[PDB]
């Protein structure tokens, strides 16, 4: 399991639609996100806690399997153009980071060969906190 996802109403809806795409049929991360969104804690973009990793946030995180640190911006697949700076929410690490708070760690093992162990070190940029309610 993983900690409950904290997400704003708009991204929750967009991801719900995203997961419906047949391109993601049978994918472990898609199935996992569907289940997690059903029990996610949602709120308006203005009510979003300032330390939560949200879509389009830039986050510094550590891989708990090897100690490696990286900075990546979490984006929707349509916007993923550079793997050295961006991370798809549909990729295991992106899905694992989504909804976590700075300071949280996650040890998410899913059947089908997917497992992520990460720690959120810093939230360099969060759209909600910057007023970019994207509305
Ligand atoms: Cl997957």
Characterise this structure.
- With 135 residues, this protein is of the alpha/beta class.
- The chain has 2 domains: 1-43, Orthogonal Bundle (GTP Cyclohydrolase I, Chain A, domain 1), CATH 1.10.286.20; 44-135, Chitinase A, domain 3 (Roll).
- The protein is built from 3 helices and 7 strands.
- It has helices at residues 9-19, 28-38, 92-97, and strands spanning 6-8, 41-43, 58-63, 69-75, 86-88, 105-110, 114-125.
- The strands form 2 sheets. It has a 5-stranded mixed sheet with strand order 5-4-3-7-6. Strands 1-2 form a two-stranded parallel sheet.
- The chain is globular and about 40 Å long.
- Strand order in the sheet with the most strands: 5-4-3-7-6
Number of β-strand runs: 7
Q: What is the level 1 CATH name of the largest domain? A: Alpha Beta
**Category from helices, strands and their pairing:** alpha/beta
N-to-C series of helices and strands = EHHEEEEHEE
Alpha plus pi helix count: 3
Please tell me what the overall shape is: globular
CATH topology of the largest domain: Chitinase A, domain 3
How many discrete structural domains?
Answer: 2
First-to-last CA distance = 32 Å
Largest sheet: 5 strands, mixed
In terms of DSSP E residues, the strand content is 25-35%
User: How much helix, percentage-wise, in residues?
Assistant: 10-25%
> What is the gyration radius calculated from CA atoms?
14 Å
Q: Mind telling me which CATH architecture of the largest domain this is?
A: Roll
Protein name: Regulator of nucleoside diphosphate kinase
Function: May act as an anti-Gre factor. Regulates the level of the nucleoside diphosphate kinase Ndk.
Subunit structure: Interacts with the RNA polymerase.
Family: Belongs to the Rnk family.
């Amino acid at each position: 399991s993983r900690p409950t996802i904290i997400i704003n109403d708009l991204d929750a809806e967009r991801i719900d639609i995203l997961l419906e795409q047949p391109a993601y049929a049978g994918l472990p991360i898609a199935d996992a996100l569907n289940a997690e969104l059903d029990r996610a804690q949602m709120c308006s973009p203005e009510e979003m806690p300032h330390d939560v990793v949200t879509m389009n946030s830039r986050v510094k995180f550590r891989n708990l399997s090897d100690g490696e640190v990286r900075v990546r911006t979490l984006v929707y697949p349509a916007k993923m153009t550079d793997s050295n700076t961006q991370l798809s929410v549909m990729a295991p690490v992106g899905a694992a980071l989504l909804g976590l708070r700075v300071g949280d760690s996650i040890h998410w093992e899913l059947p089908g060969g997917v497992a992520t162990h990460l720690e959120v070190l810093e939230l360099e940029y969060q759209p909600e906190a910057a007023g970019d309610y994207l509305l």
